[PDB]
Amino acid sequence: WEEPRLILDQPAQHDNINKRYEIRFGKIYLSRPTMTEADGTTHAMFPQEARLRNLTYSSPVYLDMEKSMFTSIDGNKVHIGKVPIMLRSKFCSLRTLDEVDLYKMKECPYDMGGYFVINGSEKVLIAQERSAANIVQVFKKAAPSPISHVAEIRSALEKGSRLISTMQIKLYGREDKGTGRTIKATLPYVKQDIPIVIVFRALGVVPDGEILQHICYDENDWQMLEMLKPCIEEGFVIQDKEVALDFIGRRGSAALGIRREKRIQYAKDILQKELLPHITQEEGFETRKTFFLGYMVNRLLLCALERKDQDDRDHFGKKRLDLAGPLLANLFRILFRKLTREIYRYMQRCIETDRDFNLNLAVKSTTITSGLKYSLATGNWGEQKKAMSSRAGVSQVLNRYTYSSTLSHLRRTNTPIGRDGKLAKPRQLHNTHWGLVCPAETPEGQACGLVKNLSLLSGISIGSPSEPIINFLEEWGMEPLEDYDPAQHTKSTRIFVNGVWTGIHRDPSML
Amino acid sequence: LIDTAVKTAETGYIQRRLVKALEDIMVHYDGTTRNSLGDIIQFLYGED
Amino acid sequence: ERACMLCGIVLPGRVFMQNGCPNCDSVLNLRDSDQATVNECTSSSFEGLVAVGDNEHSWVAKWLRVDRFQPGLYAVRVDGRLPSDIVAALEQYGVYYRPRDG
Amino acid sequence: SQFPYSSAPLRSVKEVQFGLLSPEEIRAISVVKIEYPEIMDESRQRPR
Amino acid sequence: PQRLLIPTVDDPGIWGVKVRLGKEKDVVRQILKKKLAREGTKNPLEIYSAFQRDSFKGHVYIEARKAEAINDALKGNVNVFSNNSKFLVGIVEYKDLLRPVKLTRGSYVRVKNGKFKGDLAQVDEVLENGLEARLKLVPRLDYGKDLSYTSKFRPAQRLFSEAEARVHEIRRDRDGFVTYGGEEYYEGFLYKTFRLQNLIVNSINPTLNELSLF
Amino acid sequence: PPQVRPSIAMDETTQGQDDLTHKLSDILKANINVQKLEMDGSPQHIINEVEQLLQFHVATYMDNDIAGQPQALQKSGRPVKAIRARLKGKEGRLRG
Amino acid sequence: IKQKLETQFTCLFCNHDNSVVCTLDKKNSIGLLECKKCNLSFQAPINSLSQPIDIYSDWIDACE
Amino acid sequence: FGEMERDCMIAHGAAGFLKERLMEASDAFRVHVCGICGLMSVIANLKKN
Amino acid sequence: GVKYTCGACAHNFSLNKSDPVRCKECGHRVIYKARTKRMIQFDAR
Amino acid sequence: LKHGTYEKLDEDGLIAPGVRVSGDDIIIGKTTPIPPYHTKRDASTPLRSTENGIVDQVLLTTNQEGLKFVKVRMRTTKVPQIGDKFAS
RNA sequence: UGGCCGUUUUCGUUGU
Ligand SMILES: [Zn+2]
Ligand SMILES: [Zn+2]
Ligand SMILES: [Zn+2]
Ligand SMILES: [Zn+2]
């Protein structure tokens, strides 16, 4: 559903007509794994059969296309590919058959599965780890740098939970060196930084009073006022939305000469979208974005005031574990984009002939199947032609030298921190690990401290719909930001969800 | 554990560098310590 | 696509079969002739893909002698040679021929 | 002892002289000119 | 006379732009279709023609009178590298970008097509149509030893000997002219209709075996 | 000679060509092409581009780790083996 | 110190690329541009946050 | 016969052993050189003398 | 001359390297060879 | 041809289960047609020279692509002796 | 009747 439509057009003039080909993606169909011999004979396949014959426990998939034609003078169940299935999962033969049949089917009742098979090699997925998304962290940079504090945030769309953009606020200036302590923001798809005040103005709050009240919620904290004052001092050449936006668009990393005609809208696009995408993308909701910027800068300054500690980059609560689910999701998305572009190109060099395509010579299901097969075959978690620069070692031959070894191998973790530069913060243990990872287990040598193991009562969140949650919050008197001001709600409790500010409330304890 | 794992490689590197540096110094008959070219580093090895 | 020997216009063989040459069907008789005549007047081989849309003043159009020939795909070079019958018929009607193969 | 009989006298290396190659030197030493990208004559053995 | 048609300053300018490799023909036809569709519209495409020469692979030229005209002639094309890599052309070079640019009977030629690729021959007879040329080859036949081919399992070559084919495996037409399975064998030499695309007549470097035989 | 660039028999009868031999052949191709520009239309720009390509081949043939610019690959996408690699690193001829 | 920048900007009028120099004069808050073929120049006040891209864009807007 | 082994052998000051361990128990080879250019290019045919 | 044994129906038969590799009786596609006839020894140690 | 022995194969080229194998012994004799008599080359699969035991269970089925596709599970028992490893 | 030929490159896991 991410890209549910393919669209073409034809302003054929030879009599001017606009012929539109619009292909729509519909429902997905999944099948139980099935063998098809070279003889054309087909039969439901079983794991043991696979191991014996170097097969692949895979479920061919059928997707519902929808071919449509729109001429203006002014599909079916399509076989797309084969997804390997993890044994004992809901979509494997063995979920049924109870124990007695397993003996018939030559699979030990003890083996808990949980792994895939490809060419007869029992490959396993080592769950990876990543820093939590939609969260604000503060890092002091090294002394030999005009940057003193950094407020990095990696935003990812809640739906899917996929990386979109990464943003940083850098507190420039040194101690009586660098003159005033200017704050210059960094934005996506640009080659140069921008002052904070400029982005405040270009997003709707042009006047200084609104800007300072949004950033600051402690008026008596004169230090904040005087430390952001240099930004105010330099933030006077810009006084309206428009020159601010053009300033942004004048450094849009785009072509040269997009003029004030289209450059302003380029800036408005790069501001509405590509910026804090996890919050929103529609117009008329810049209030949320401005409030979030204000919170970010307030926290950054507070860290710059040493009134609170910088978050520990090894803190586990800020760490998230990627299981097989999302990993396969991302790989499938890459293969899906490739398939979509394949179909679009075939439409290009088959529609001009105006020959009705069969949706069968076009869709090359070989792409998905070969891609997934090779990816899990070598673990090079990406397309073959980009073997280099590809996260490696995420799929490995399962170890069955003993039952306990196999049990451990299926609860392993990993860290994508590499080894170029030893350091010790990533490798060492931490207090937060209490009751979530084994304080006793880890390999030896280069990986010592990286590869972890979940405790004996660990559990991984799969995600729940937040819409009922917000409904409850909204059901319970939460006060939107549009009724928020530092003066009034100086003791009311801000409310956050999934890392995104989502309201204001005064009496939280009952809530 | 981490400390040992880190220290071993660094010690190996330092030992390699040193060995490469002094690898050519030898003691001739005259009692003077010269590298390949003939530079004299100690006129009497170790001063004894 | 087969390029007409005289004007150089190249269009799908179905176009010549159903409509002849856009410029030379009046003198070459491609639309209402046998397949041999069309094939010899339009060989599958051509070179110099020149996309001409404006020719009344285009320098290249004058160069190739396609200023009068309707703008389109024209063949700078064509291999082979026409039979004797087509050349003789064209010379009879006032059309001295010049292959563009160069 | 491993090598067969050879008439040339046997001695050791004393000096190594570095320095580039004069193109006439290369021509004086090369025994062939390379002109054919096709390594294998016609896939009929006997490379070109 | 083409000599009095030489270009001038008042003739339209030309810019040579790079596009996606191999899809130069696609970009050329896209340009033609845009010009034909935008011919006379309120914003007509200000070009005279677009052309590509095979030797200049990846290079596309559009005849316009302003840089933005070339930009919009190449705009809206995915088969073009997004860069506006265009370079002007000298007056003498304008005609050099459109210059178009040895098959005789008894000429030693080699084959490249099908099973008999890489075999030198003599061109025998050229059809009137001018697309197929007869060749004189040394057959590579198996005399019904394994009949119950490609360019990698093929046995060696040898002139047709009628006696061997008679003894092992044949409609004699004339003295030395044998029709054997749709193949013409004159005086022991293989004769077949070879498409001119399948043969090489220029730049043939005779080999040791050819000196021994030819 | 081949002594320095022997070929790898992937599976006995199947023989694959040394990457150095491929780079040598590609340099020969670029050279031959550079020969056949002056005898036909050579609108300056083409000659310069082809010259740069030949220089690029002969360079990556002798160092595939030239700073600042992308490396050369095989049909497999893996970076080429220039002689500088053959001599440097732990596995160079010296330390190897 | 005046910097003479031979930026890759193209000139609108003389149909030549890299024939445009967007000189910087911050001393008096003045913009200067030098062309190489038609030698045209553009003048405009510049502030601390203005850059050759900004001068070029303002020049384009003025020309149109 | 890694670096460190070579260094230990040097330290024990055993020359000839190190020589042969790196010569006869490894790629022992013979060549010819021209005394003028000093290079190995001398084309020789031993049996042909 | 070269006996076999099915993995699904466990009925014996043979083949002469020309028949397709399938069970004659139940059609199954997994087979095993059977024990040789020369004598097998163990020292029980 | 290899330097090892072939006699333990069957008449069709596979070794029967229950036969003892030794180092440098051929267990699977495969032949490749030679691109042009005497036009075949050994493509055997000799046992790892550092192993011994008895062949136990020979499998012979088609691959995904319909060619013969064999598997030989040789076995032996490891007696602890001088030079093993153990751990509490 | 001597004579006699078994890949590389990656990545992984481990071992001291
Ligand atoms: Zn015509
Ligand atoms: Zn100018
Ligand atoms: Zn010499
Ligand atoms: Zn059976």
Q: Per-domain residue ranges for chain I? A: 1-45
Instruction: Tell which residue, A253, A243, A238, has the closest CA to residue A197.
Output: A238
Cα distances (angstroms) measured from residue E93 to each of A281, E14, E53, E67, F34: 52, 10, 13, 19, 19
Instruction: Indicate the SS3 state at residue A157.
Output: strand
Instruction: Indicate the SS3 state at residue A116.
Output: strand
Q: Mark whether G and B touch (3+ CB pairs within 8 Å).
A: no
| A296: number of Cβ within 10 Å | 21
Domain count, chain G: 1
d(CA C72, CA C2): 13
d(CA A92, CA A59): 9
DSSP string, A232-289: HHHTTS--SHHHHHHHHHTTSSS-S--HHHHHHHHHHHHHHSSSSTTT--STT-HHHH
| C78: number of Cβ within 10 Å | 25
Query: Interface of chain A against chain J, CB under 8 Å?
Result: 37-39, 52-55
Domain membership of residue G23 as a residue range: 1-64
d(CA F65, CA F81): 10
Instruction: Indicate the SS3 state at residue B37.
Output: coil
Cα distances (angstroms) measured from residue A249 to each of A231, A253, A258, G16: 20, 8, 9, 25
Greatest pairwise CA separation for chain H in angstroms: 46
CB H10 within 8 A of CB B23: yes
Instruction: Indicate the SS3 state at residue A345.
Output: helix
- Which positions 2-21 of H are in contact with B (Cβ < 8 Å)? 3-4, 7, 10
d(CA D40, CA H38): 35
Ligand closest to Cα of G39 equals 2
Q: Give the residue carrying structure tokens 């910027």.
A: A293
Q: What angle do CA F39, F42, F43 make, to 5 degrees?
A: 160
Q: Which residues of E57-85 are buried (b: 16+ CB within 10 A; e: fewer)?
A: ebbbbbbbeebebbebbbeebebbeeebe
* Distance, CA of A443 to C1' of K14, in Å: 10
Instruction: Tell which residue, C10, B14, B3, B34, has the closest CA to residue A449.
Output: B3
Instruction: Tell which residue, C50, C24, C49, has the closest CA to residue C37.
Output: C24
Domains of chain C (ranges, CATH numbers):
1-102 (3.30.40.210)
Classify burial at J25, counting beta carbons within 10 Å of its beta carbon; exposed 0-12, middle 13-18, buried 19 or more. Answer: buried
Query: What is the structure's resolution, reported in angstroms to one decimal?
Result: 4.1
Instruction: Tell which residue, E54, E58, E46, E53, has the closest CA to residue E13.
Output: E46
CB G59 within 8 A of CB G42: yes
Q: Please identify, in words, the CATH class of the domain defined by I1-45.
A: mainly beta
Q: After which residues is chain A broken (C to N over 2.5 A)?
A: 14, 74
Domain membership of residue A284 as a residue range: 137-320
Instruction: Tell which residue, C66, C17, C72, has the closest CA to residue C42.
Output: C17
Q: What is the CATH number of the domain that holds G4?
A: 2.20.25.190
Question: Would the CB atoms of H46 and D2 count as touching at under 8 Å?
Answer: no
CB C101 within 8 A of CB E43: no
Structure token digits, residue B41: 């580093």
Question: Would the CB atoms of F43 and E16 count as touching at under 8 Å?
Answer: yes
Beta carbons within 8 Å of J86's beta carbon, 6+ residues apart:
none
Instruction: Tell which residue, E36, E38, E33, E31, has the closest CA to residue E15.
Output: E31
The minimum CA-CA distance between J63 and chain A, rounded to whole Å, is 6
A96 at E interface, C-beta within 8 A: no
Query: Footprint of strand K, using CB within 7 A?
Result: A 379, 387, 392-393, 396-397, 399, 443-445, 447, 451; F 8-12, 78; J 1-3, 42-44
CB A182 within 8 A of CB A233: no
Give the residues across from A155 on adjacent strands.
A165
d(CA G64, CA G59): 9
Classify burial at A221, counting beta carbons within 10 Å of its beta carbon; exposed 0-12, middle 13-18, buried 19 or more. Answer: middle
Provide the total of helices (H) and of strands (E) in chain A, helices listed first.
12, 21
Q: What is the CATH number of the domain that holds A210?
A: 3.90.1110.10
Give the residues across from A320 on adjacent strands.
A130
CB C53 within 8 A of CB E36: yes
Q: Mark whether F and E touch (3+ CB pairs within 8 Å).
A: yes
| E136: number of Cβ within 10 Å | 20
d(CA I20, CA J67): 10
d(CA A47, CA A57): 6
Provide the pairing of β-strand A34-36 with C2-4. Answer: unpaired
Classify burial at F79, counting beta carbons within 10 Å of its beta carbon; exposed 0-12, middle 13-18, buried 19 or more. Answer: middle
